[PDB]
Structures are given as C-alpha cells and as structure tokens.
Design a protein around this ligand. Structure first.
Ligand SMILES: Nc1ncnc2c1ncn2[C@@H]1O[C@H](COP(=O)(O)OP(=O)(O)O)[C@@H](O)[C@H]1O
Ligand SMILES: Nc1ncnc2c1ncn2[C@@H]1O[C@H](COP(=O)(O)OP(=O)(O)O)[C@@H](O)[C@H]1O
Ligand SMILES: Nc1ncnc2c1ncn2[C@@H]1O[C@H](COP(=O)(O)OP(=O)(O)O)[C@@H](O)[C@H]1O
Ligand SMILES: [Cl-]
Ligand SMILES: [Cl-]
Ligand SMILES: [Cl-]
Ligand SMILES: [Cl-]
Ligand SMILES: [Cl-]
Ligand SMILES: [Cl-]
Ligand SMILES: [Cl-]
Ligand SMILES: [Cl-]
Ligand SMILES: [Cl-]
Lengths: 274, 259, 274, 259, 259, 274
C-alpha cells in the first residue's frame, strides 16, 4: 500500500550496493547524507528500501549521540560500526549503519538546553572511519584484524559545512530529498489507494496543496474517522470509555473505512490551513 | 451542577481516545490546541470532561513555563510527559498532560520547540542529556491559550497538532450560566434573559456577576455601620436579592467600570 | 484634604470585611491583587483606607522578598501571617497582611542584577496559605493550633500568569486601578483643595492633561514654591544656607501658600511635558 | 576668579535646598537633569556652586557607568547614594550625589532603571541582595548629559526629575569668558568683543583658545631653534601677546581646523 | 592529470610570493579572498597550485569556525597562524594559512575581526591573553567563500586584502573538464562538445556527471538482479559506456532533477 | 620621501616641548590622546616626528596591556614611566612614553574573547601619574626620590568617557586626526613622489577618492608591481620559486619601478572599490 519513490530507492540501493562492489576507476563514498525538511518520509522511505532489499540495519539515534549517557559518541559510532561489520561476515548479507536525525535539537527544534550533539566530534569520527573503513578500532585498541567495509546512511534536516571536506574528497555524498509533483502523486496515491479516488483526483489533491508535505495529506485522511470515534464514545458512555480502550479485556473496537470525496478532502484541507 | 458544552466534550474526548486507539493506516495528532477569548471556560470545561471520563490529568501552568524562575521549561515539560506516560502503565487508565494559558518570547520558542519534538516521537521522549532505550506510552497533550503562535503552523499542517477554536454560542451560555446560578432559584427564562441581556460578554463576566451580588450586600452593610466602626462590629447573613432585575442592575454597573 | 476614591475604598473594605464574615453560598478570596501603573496612588489609597477603618497593617516590602537577608521568603511570609493573626486575637480588631511592590525590579525597573524576587516561591506560598488560611505552619513545624484567617493585599504593576490558578479557584481577586475622569476630578480636586479653584477649573485641568498620572498633578503644584525658596536662599546667603536648613538650631523656614491660576498651571504643565 | 551664572546658581541651589526642606503637602523631585551642548560648563558651574555653598559632593563619572569594566552600574550608584546619605547624618551638612556626562545602551537602561527606583523611594535605597530596615537620608541627585533618553520621560512627568536646559546667553558668556581671561589684563569691552566675535561657540572653545596662545609661542620657539636641535636646547619665558587681535587671529585659525 | 587554470595559478602565486618579497616602498595585502559560485574549483585549484609550488598549507575549514562546538574561532585562527609562522622559520619554505568556505553571524564578525587585526600587524600575532615580544614571520592568508561580507570592505580599501572573483570561462572549463575525463578516452572535440552542451553549469556538475555514469551501470545491474535478491548476489565489472552521447544523456537527466 | 603633516608635527612637538618647559600661567597636560580612524598614519606620523626631533621612545603595546602576562598593567605603566624618566636624566635628551592602540579589541575589532584591556585601571593609573608626574612609585614602594616628568602619548580609535576628568582638569588633551584635503595632497604626494606625477594629477587623484584613507592610496601604488612579480615567477618556474625567495642564498630579485599614469591609477582605484 505504501509507495516507494523509485529515485529514492535507486539512490539508496546504488549507494549500498556500490559499497559492496570493488569497482576501480572511481572512488565510492562510504557515507550517504540524506537531507530535506520534516514530514517528507526521509526515514520512512529508507525503511521501505531496507525491507525491500532485506537489509539489516544498525541504528543510532541523534538523541543518543546528544546524551552523555552514550559516553563518547566517537566510541559509540565505532562500536556500532564494528558491530555491523561482523554481521556482514556472519549473516553473509548486506548490512548498514544508520545515524538518524544527526541534528537533533538544532534550529527551530532548539530547546535551549546545555546538551547538544557534538557535531564536530561526530564529523571527525566519520572522517577517520571513511579514510580507512577496514581499520576501525575503538579509542585505545590497536591490535585488531581488518574488518568489513560498512556503508553509512545519515539523515538530517541539513548538514554542516564541517562535512564539506568529506564531500570534497568523495567520502560522502549529499542527497537532497524534496518530493516533486511526480513523487507526490505516487506517495499521496498510495495513501488514498483504497479510497476509490481516480488518478486525476489524486493529481487534483496534490495540485490543490502544492506547498504541503507528505504528512499533511496522511493527516488529511486520518481526521475522517472522528465521527465514528465520537459515536463509539457515546455508545460506551463517557463514564466507561477509559476502561474500554486502555484495558485489553474485550476486543479492540472495529471501525469501518468511510466513503469520502475529493471535494470533502479539499474542504478539510483548507480548514486545516485556514 | 456545572454544565459542559456537548461539542466541547466531544472534541476533547475524541482527541484523547483517538490517541489511545491504534488504528492502522491512521496517524493521530498528539496535541489539541484549544484557543479563543480569555475566560470562556477552556480550562474549566477541560476539567469537567476529565472528571466525567475519570481521567487523571498532569497540569502545567503557563506561568510556570514563562517565568525565568522556572529555569528550564523544556526539562519541566519532558519530566511531566514521562511522568504521565508512567501513570498509564501503572494505573492502566487514560492519562493526559495539559498546559494552561500558553499565550517570555524566548521561552515561547523553547516550549514550541519542545512540543514539536515530542509530537514527532511521542514514544521516544528523553530528558535533556539522558537516553533510555525503553519506549514509553503515548500521552495526549491538551494546550490552552488565547491564540497560538505562527510557530505552531508546522505542527498543524503536518497533523501533529489539532486546533479547536472555542467561542460559546447562545445555547452554550444558557447551559453554562444556568449551572453558575443553579442554586439561586432562577428559572430557564430568567437564565435566557440574563444571557440575552449581555450577549457579548465572556463566561467569566457571569461568574463574576454572581460574586458581585454578595459584595454589594457587604458594601451596603459597611455603609450602614460606617467605615469608622466596621472593625469592631465584625470582630450580611441573609440570602441576597439575586432577582433577575438585581443581576442586570449589577451587570450594567460592571460594564460601566470594567477593565 | 486627601480624596479617597469611593470605589477604591469599597473594593478594599469589602474584601477585608468579607474575610471576617462567614457567608455560605460563595467562596471568599483571601488575596486581593491591586495592579496598575505607577503614580496613581495604589499604595496611598490603601493607607487612607486602613486609616479610615482603623486597620493595623503588617507590611512586607518587595525589596524584602528580593533579598536573601530575608532568608526564605516562604518562611517570612508565613511568619508575618501568623504575626498578623495573633494581633486579631489580641487586639480584637481587623488586621491585614500586605505585600507591596510584589514585582520589585521587573521590566522597566530591571537593574540587571543577580537578585530578583523568587516569584514562583512567593506564588507557591500564597497558594498553600490560601488553601488553608487557618493552618499556616512554618516549614518544619507541625504541632500548632488553628489560627485566625488573615486577609492579604498584594500590590504590583501587574501579576504573573503564575497567579491564574489562584484566581481561577477564587483564592485571589485582581483589581485593576486606573483612575477614571471622575476619580481624577476627585483626587486632583483634593490636591488643589485650598487653592481656590472652582469645580470647572479642576475639570479643565484634568481635561487638559488626560493621559497623565496623579503624580503629574501634585508635582505641578509643588514647583510653584520655587520662587520663595530662591529668595529665601538669597536672604540667608549661599555661604550659610547649608547650616540654616540642615542644622535644626533655629526654627524651620515658614513659607506662605502662593496664589496661582488655572492658566498658570496649564502653562507649567506644557513646559514639563515639552 | 571664575564666574558662576546667576540663573545656574539659583536653579541648582533651589533644587538641593528644596530636597532638604520638608514642606508638607509639597512633593519634590530628587533628580536635577542638566542638559545642553557639550562643554558649556554644566560640570564646571556645578562645582563652582558646591564650593560656594560648601556642599560636599559624591561624584560618579559617566564613563564609570558605561564601561563594561565597571561590571555593575546599579550597584555602584546605590553604593554612592547610601554613602552620601551617611555623610549627611555624620557631617550634618548638605551633601549631593552627581553623575557626569550621562549621555552602553544596555547600561543606559540599567542606570535609568536605578535612578527611577531610587527616585521612587529616596529613603529606602538598599544594595542589590541586601535589606536594611533603617531609613536613610534623602540625597538630591544632579545629573549632567547632552540630552536625556526618552526613558527619563516618566520621571519628568511624575515630578521625580526636573530637567534644566543649559544654553549660556551673551551675558553668561561675558561673565564666564571674563573669568577665563581674568588675569590676562583684558578690559570689559575687549571681553565683550571676543564673545561677539565668536557668538556660536561653546565655553570650551574659549578656554581652549587661551591655551592655544601659549602653544603658539612654543610652536614658534621650536621653529626658530629647529626640530633638529630642540631636544638639546630644552634639556618661551615671556608673557604671550594676549592682545584682543592675537586671540581673534588664533580663534579663526581654530575654526578653520576644528574637529 | 588535473588542470590548473593559468590565471588562477598566477593570481595565487603572485599573492603568496609578494608576501615573502620585502620590496621597500611597497605594502602588500596579507589576505587573498577568492570568491565566486560554489563548486567552481576554488579549493581544488588552490591545492593544485600548492602542490605545484611545493607549498605546505595549514587548512582551516569554514564549518570549524561556524559551529558553536568550536568554541573560540579567534583563538583557533591565531593558533594556526602562529603555527604556520613557525614552519617558515623551521622548514625555510613558503607556507600558507587557508580558510575554506567562509560564507554563525556572531562568528562571522569574530572571524572578520580576527583577520582584520592579523592583517594590521602580521608580525605581531598573539593568542588572546598572551604576549610575546618575539616577532613572528608574516604568513599569507588565502580565504575562499561564495561572497565576502561588507564587513571585509575596510580590508579591501586599505589594501590589507585582495579580492579575486573566480568564474571559469570556456577555455578554463575545457582544461578542467578535460582533466576530469582524462582517463576515459575522450578526444578534444568530445570534451569541447561536453562543455558546450552544458555552458551554464559548475565544474562540480561535471565531476558529478562522471560519477553518475558508474551509478547508472550499478542501477541497471540492480534492476536486472532485482531488489529482492541483490544482497545475496553481491555478498558492474566492465568499463561503462562513457561515450559523449551517454554523458549528455545523463547530464540532461540530472538537470531535470538537480537540487 | 615621506611627508609629515606640519600640523601633526607641530601638535606633537609642542606637546612634548611644553612638558619640558616650566611656563607659569597655564597648566601643561602630561598626556596627548591622538584618536581617529585606521589607515591615516597616526602612529606613522608620530614615528616620523620622533625621528625628526631625535626623541627616544618607550613603547607599550595595547596588546601588552590586554595580556595578564603583563601582570598588573598599572604596574607596567609605572615601570615604563620610571624607565623613561631615568633616560632623561642619563641621556640628557627628550624622552617619551607612548601607549599604542589603547583600545585593542574594542568595537569592529572585537574577537569576543575573555581578555580585554582593563581600561578603567589604565585610566585610573594615568590619572594618578598625571596628578603627580614627579612622584610615580610602583604599588607597594614608598621611599623613592623625585623623578623627571615624562610626557605621555596615547593613540587609539577613540577615547572613553572615562578620560573626561583628565581632559576637564587639563591633565590630558585630545587630538583628533583626520587628514584634510591639504594633508592628503601632501601625504599622497610623498607616496607618488618618484612617479613623475604633477601637482594637479596628485590633486585629481585625491579628489577622485575623497572618502578613502591614506592606506588606500599606498595600496593603489603597490599593486602595479604584480606583472613583474608574475613574470619573475615564470622565469624561475613554479617548481623552484619557494627556494629562490625564502632561501637567502642568491641575491634578492631586483625590480624596476614601473611607469604609470593618473588614468591607470584611477582605473585601478575604481576596480578596488567596485
Ligand atoms: N463550565 C463552567 N461552569 C461554571 N463556571 C464556569 C465554567 N466555565 C467557566 N466558568 C467561569 O469562568 C472561569 C474563567 O474561565 P476559564 O476556564 O479560566 O477560561 P480560559 O481558560 O478560557 O481563560 C471558570 O473558572 C469560571 O469561574
Ligand atoms: N565657569 C567656567 N569658568 C572657567 N572655565 C569654564 C567654566 N565653565 C566651563 N569652562 C571651560 O570649559 C570646560 C568644559 O566644560 P564642562 O564643564 O565640562 O561642560 P559640560 O559638562 O557641559 O561638557 C570647563 O572645564 C572649562 O575648561
Ligand atoms: N581542478 C579540478 N580538477 C578536477 N576536478 C575539479 C577541479 N576543480 C573542481 N573539481 C570538481 O569539483 C570540486 C568542487 O569544487 P571546489 O574546489 O570545492 O569549489 P569551491 O571551493 O569553489 O566550492 C572539486 O573537488 C572537484 O570534485
Ligand atoms: Cl575518532
Ligand atoms: Cl499549499
Ligand atoms: Cl454584552
Ligand atoms: Cl511554602
Ligand atoms: Cl496628557
Ligand atoms: Cl561663532
Ligand atoms: Cl548549462
Ligand atoms: Cl594605579
Ligand atoms: Cl571615495
């Protein structure tokens, strides 16, 4: 039911596969930096691609690299790297290290706290790894055998100028994700795939809200269930609704998919934006 | 008995319940932003609904997030969120986080930023500097304010926050005002007349009008006894007029000298 | 000679008296918050009312709550509360606790120092007291008998949103003080009461400077004595003026009240504003 | 002997004395703000009057409050205020606090804020963080500056501060300039001519003009001896021309190359 | 073999050498500000010239000065300057300090301020808080950025900094692009055609175009094998088309979906 | 070849000489404060004057007074003062103490570091010295004989209001240096003195760039040598240019003075400003 943008799947599949091939004549970047604004399915499209290709993923949260409880982020990144490399030797399949939301509380998400991702240390680490993907030792350790090369995917809203040297030496490649009209028709099409909307109506929906994100359209669909939810609360009664939903004694409530029109969707859309 | 406006009760109940229902292929907004004129019962009716539904609420005051004496509003929000998340696991009931009178400019950005981050991942809400692999329960957030900053537009567009404008209509006033004077022996028509006499006023005006009727009796009692000997006299026992005529008389005197 | 605004006296007298009556059917707020801008006689009108009604007042300065030398402000507020309550039992008269300038160095009065009133602790304390005015123990003390309810008056330029819960539960009532035209005619009338100005001229004076504070008008009157003061300095001579005034050997200089017109007052007023 | 302008002496003396007189039913401004063009003798004449009246003055420089090296200007003002307040009790004489050249933007607000707070309660002036039940003596404050910020308008409206614009007229110049050249053997008409020759200049120009007459002699002495051997010669003894013609000659050369 | 544009090599070599020549009666700018569109080879050609001239370079990244994680950019610049100054004394060769991608706003002022101060006295460059009577060697500084703030105008006016706008012309592209595809068996006319096909693009586009030719082969190999079984297959061996037709085909597909 | 502005030389020579004469009837300022913007030859004109008059100079850098490594700046200033005074008694010639760039990293030169010149301590010191130039003891020392008066020259972009008391008591004199048209013709004339430009062309050059500093014009002249420098690099070859210039084995390269016109200078000027 979920639509994968072909060019998104291609970019990510080519990047990973290219890191498991040894093609001379060109340098392969170890790191793929996927940036773009929120609510466009950056991470979600990655997951669809990893599922599609059967790729196991070692994950590092940006809130993990932000926290002193992660100890030294340089140490954590290296550990997870060596962890992912072993899985390649063991599982005998493509494995990927992924660092999500590399700029956790930066910009319009800044909460003005003491703690922030040591981006310069993270950058420095990725630079050290990228220079020699086969020899990635923990700080202090020296006597260890060559290790498997692990492709790295990093996502964020944008990437610092600190990453320019990585890019300039082809150790990293930036991929800007902003869904175009063709992408939106595809993605929004998959969201309303079971709602009996034609190709044109889906195009009209996209064309009616050309500046909105993918999340705007899925949110548009979700609010239609509210009438059923209201009625369901009335039947159960306000006094007992809490027990009915949170206590998993009786079966969860079964809701029907509602019939709606492009007209209705557009009306709702304008109300949301209004 | 105090009156809850049906469409207010619905909107709030649907939002909370919708956050505890895990319908697949359906993404839910975590935040309900209730906005409108001050003193229209945004807070009071929220509390009526929580009582009605037996919902335990974790309440943060807006002034608690604005005052520099609070220090770190991001921390305070995240603490109260994780606390409420735990009460869901423990009590096995619907629980809610609520932020009141949200409408300083430095902190408004930080609060907005915090609610955005939480709404992006309601399950992964860590304290600043801390990290915990344990997923916590999703906690619906109810916010109250006069109007919400354009900083909240991204949340509303992406369906991470739902706005709900609260402006009580005539029926809503008749119900609410009727509950305010429920024990003052006023008929339906006398309640309808009172509302129709002050059609542009907030619910706050009417609850204030009731209190002033008592103040009037106390004022006249002081004038009779005199300011000179009022202290000795005390150191105003009968039920006040409360007629529809007396209330209208007081209301017009308040409108002549309001704020 | 000083004019008390009736509605100011009523509000304050009703608030206090209401706290010594036990009228059912309505909750009595313990706290009256009087706010409004400077130079309008907030505190001065309170004092006139307390004198009028023979009410003894326990005072807490905002600069007191700002100072660590006051120790714990929660502790100080409670002490003064219990102190005022005993006076009710002893004196057998109405007694009031009053906290002045609750926002000392906030806003346009901010001197950018480390020290400021812990408004959140003060608020928290008043909330604890207001919830149970009869049981107000010092932090740590527990075994103490019920105490007399003490009405509290707080003054400030404005009150934080922190006080909304107190207001919402009717534990506190806000009273905004901005003198209206009728109030000004009264107050300004009392200022120029012995200056042989008619009712109309006093109205004209108020109408000529409609945006000014009460302090503007009293200041207007005070500057007229300057000629007498000048001449008095000349007679005594600049060499000996310091001894004459500061050393209380001989009698203080006796000044006559000058004759002046509405015209003169308005001219002076425009010069001051100019 | 240096000349104090009578209306300047009056205005300043009346302000100070008025602050030590406790006339009932009469409220006094604590602050006198003397404003006007730079170098017109605002500071110099203040000092002449204090000497005349035997007033001990506590002086704070404007640069002392503007430089971030000062740290806390609010503290510094309050320290000097309480200090002056104590000298009144001890010496039993009129004492004054004076702030010079008040005309950075961060500190200007803090200074304004401090003077406002003090002027509101001249008797209750505590240091930040300190509290003392003891009332202290009221200390008149004299401020000097080119012009006062609109931040001071509330003070002036409420009669907590009096403004006094200082622009010396012809009579004032004749007196002041006459005192500058008092020991140079110039007649009244020669002083009047000098002022009338430079009618738009500040008092600062004239005291600077006198100093330049000496510099001219020294300049010519160096030209005669030569820059090559001037060091040996020294390591310019007679009274300079000082005629009304020579002063005018110098003045025009200064106006041709001023600032 | 990679191509350096002659006028780029000249301008940069003249600037460095001019800073090591002590011609009397001739003052030299310390800083060369190379500005122009992003990805036109400002950095890459600087490195080619340093290699050509055997110049050891001390390199600071622009992001190293912009990120608040750096802490003190003034310190970092001064440290690297004194370090380079010492390498001149030790190695007895031309050395250079270079700051890349200089085009946050708080730090831009601090960087500008630092470069101004250094350019005023290249011999007297102390660390903040430190002082050393020892004069150090003059170190030419090369800066790179899209455009330089008007904060740098004083430097350029006083001849403490020279601006050099870099926009590669056709000849420059033919040379540079020719070096990018030097080992791909393309003739001169095929290189000239490639440049003339994309006359408005940056050098970055062309080096990116070469890399995409390999990505295309890998993409088609994945489509053939299928996404389902690509992992097993691997856990794309031949020389790609690289014809002038294939490059143009790829380029147009990149222009249809760029940034 | 270098032009000294007469009025600059006069002001500085009169100030110094006046400090070695004991002329009654007027107070002599000990301190001359020379301020004005950068690139106008403030310090350079001072040096030309000191050379002209054979005056030895004790120097204090503003970066010296900024550094804790200078210890106590009050102590340093006093030491250098007493050091300069002894040279007067020994050398038997005019000697001067000079404090350069008294506002090192202030304003548009602020690098946002912890360290800045303690201007208030420096001011306080100069005030103490100026009050009694003959008795300048180090902090702690007391038993020392009278010392020679030393004139002080301070340069900066501007001087704080902290220096007003020094000025007001005639202990200090401000001298604003902004070269006028006559000064520029002189200074720029000396810069292009050997370039066969007429008086009018030099006036035209100045009039073409009326808002520019002296440094703008000298920079204008310097860039003309670039062609010779380019060619010289080509002859030696890029591979060996570093050895040729930095290694002082062979003689330094000999460059000829180029011929150029007013037209060429103006073209270059507009390009620089453009
Ligand atoms: N539902 C109600 N029943 C009785 N009184 C009400 C009701 N709603 C509002 N009030 C009167 O006005 C108050 C002020 O309204 P509030 O809930 O604070 O509105 P807001 O939160 O919109 O400012 C309530 O505390 C009350 O005194
Ligand atoms: N009354 C005076 N008698 C002699 N000289 C004066 C007099 N007033 C001003 N001056 C000459 O000009 C100075 C600069 O004036 P000042 O008092 O500083 O004015 P402002 O404080 O207005 O800048 C005085 O110090 C002095 O050198
Ligand atoms: N001279 C060159 N030879 C080969 N490739 C070049 C050359 N110059 C630029 N490039 C291609 O584009 C890059 C991006 O250009 P860069 O030097 O970073 O420009 P800027 O510094 O102007 O952004 C170089 O690293 C390279 O991949
Ligand atoms: Cl590392
Ligand atoms: Cl849109
Ligand atoms: Cl109404
Ligand atoms: Cl408490
Ligand atoms: Cl007005
Ligand atoms: Cl004039
Ligand atoms: Cl093109
Ligand atoms: Cl000292
Ligand atoms: Cl110009």
């Amino acid at each position: 039911s979920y639509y994968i943008a072909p060019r998104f799947l291609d970019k990510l599949a080519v990047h990973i596969t290219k890191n498991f091939l040894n093609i001379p004549g060109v340098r392969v970047p170890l790191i793929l930096g996927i940036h773009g604004r929120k609510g466009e399915g950056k991470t979600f499209q990655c997951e669809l691609a990893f599922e599609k290709m059967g790729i196991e993923v070692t994950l590092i949260s940006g809130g993990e690299l932000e926290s002193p409880d992660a100890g030294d982020p340089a140490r954590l990144i290296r550990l997870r790297y060596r962890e992912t490399a072993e899985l390649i030797k063991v599982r005998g399949k493509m494995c990927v290290l992924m660092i999500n939301d590399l700029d956790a509380g930066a910009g319009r998400f800044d909460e003005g706290t003491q703690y922030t991702v040591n981006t310069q240390l993270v950058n420095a680490t990725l630079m050290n790894i990228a220079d020699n993907p086969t020899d990635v030792q923990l700080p202090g350790s020296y006597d260890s055998n060559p290790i498997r090369r692990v492709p790295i995917i990093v996502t964020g809203n944008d990437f610092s100028t600190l990453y320019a040297p990585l890019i300039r030496d082809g150790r990293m490649e930036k991929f800007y994700w902003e869904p175009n009209r063709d992408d939106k028709v595809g993605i929004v099409g998959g969201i309303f795939a079971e709602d009996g909307l034609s190709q044109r109506e889906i195009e009209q929906l996209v064309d009616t809200f050309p500046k909105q994100s993918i999340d705007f359209f899925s949110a548009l669909r979700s609010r239609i269930y509210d009438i059923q939810i209201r009625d369901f609360i009335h039947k159960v009664g306000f006094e007992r609704i809490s027990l009915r939903v949170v206590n998993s004694l009786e079966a969860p409530p079964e809701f029907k998919k509602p019939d709606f029109s492009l007209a209705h969707l557009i009306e709702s859309g304008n109300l949301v934006l209004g």
